[PDB]
Each structure stands twice: as structure tokens, then as C-alpha cells.
Design a binder for this molecule. Structure first.
Ligand code: UMB
Length: 110
């Protein structure tokens, strides 16, 4: 990985770490719409994204730069903000994990 992709991989490891598990857990795996009774999820969310998919893409060297990595992490949060009412617990958890993401992503090495 490049220096910027190593910074991205470090962020990914932190988002998956026990440190953030209390609010990160809804983003660990793809939303199982059927299991959760969310029969409109795939009509509203055209591009599902989650941290296990980001991890697989990082492991497969799919991401060519930090911008591509950040686009998937932000897509995951955007899906949450699009599908859910803004007062839902999952949105509070998305905002908290996105705060962790944005502040560390901003420390990208130049
Ligand atoms: C990324 N996951 C989700 O978007 C999601 C959605 C919904 C859900 O039921 N949404 C509907 C829309 C509105 O009518 C309520 C539930 C969960 C699981 C969860 C529950 C409680 C707390 C944290 C997660 N995750």
C-alpha cells in the first residue's frame, strides 16, 4: 500500500477496534434488509456499503488512492442518513463514527 493507503488502513482498523464498538457495530457487516424487515432498503439504497466490504476492498488492493477509500466510508454513512429518520439511534451512532473518521482522515500525510 502507498503511504496515504496505509493511513486509510490505520483508520479502517480503528473504526473496527473495540475502542468504537459501542457505536461502530451497525456498520461491521452489510445491512441484512430481509432479516431486519427493511423490505424498502434496496429500493432506497442503490449502493450498499459497510466496513467488511471496505476491508475486503483494502485487502484486495481495490482502492488505488485515499479519495476512493473515503468515498466508500462516506457512502456507508450517507446510506444511513438517507434511509433512517434523523432521530433514530443508528443515525446517532453513524454521526459518532463519522466524527472519528473525518478527524483522523483530515490528518492524511501530504
Ligand atoms: C446501517 N444500519 C441501518 O441503517 C439500520 C436501520 C434500521 C432500521 O430499522 N431502520 C428503519 C427505518 C425506520 O423506519 C427504522 C435498523 C438497524 C439496526 C440498529 C438498530 C438499533 C440501533 C442501531 C442499529 N440498522
Amino acid at each position: 500500500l502507498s503511504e496515504q493507503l496505509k493511513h486509510c488502513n490505520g483508520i479502517l482498523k480503528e473504526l473496527l477496534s473495540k475502542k468504537h464498538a459501542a457505536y461502530a457495530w451497525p456498520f461491521y457487516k452489510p445491512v441484512d434488509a430481509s432479516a431486519l424487515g427493511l423490505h424498502d432498503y434496496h429500493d432506497i439504497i442503490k449502493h450498499p456499503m459497510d466496513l467488511s466490504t471496505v476491508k475486503r476492498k483494502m485487502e484486495n488492493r481495490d482502492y488505488r488512492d485515499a479519495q476512493e477509500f473515503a468515498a466508500d466510508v462516506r457512502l456507508m454513512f450517507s446510506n444511513c442518513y438517507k434511509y433512517n429518520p434523523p432521530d433514530h439511534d443508528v443515525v446517532a451512532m453513524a454521526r459518532k463514527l463519522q466524527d472519528v473518521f473525518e478527524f483522523r482522515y483530515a490528518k492524511m500525510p501530504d
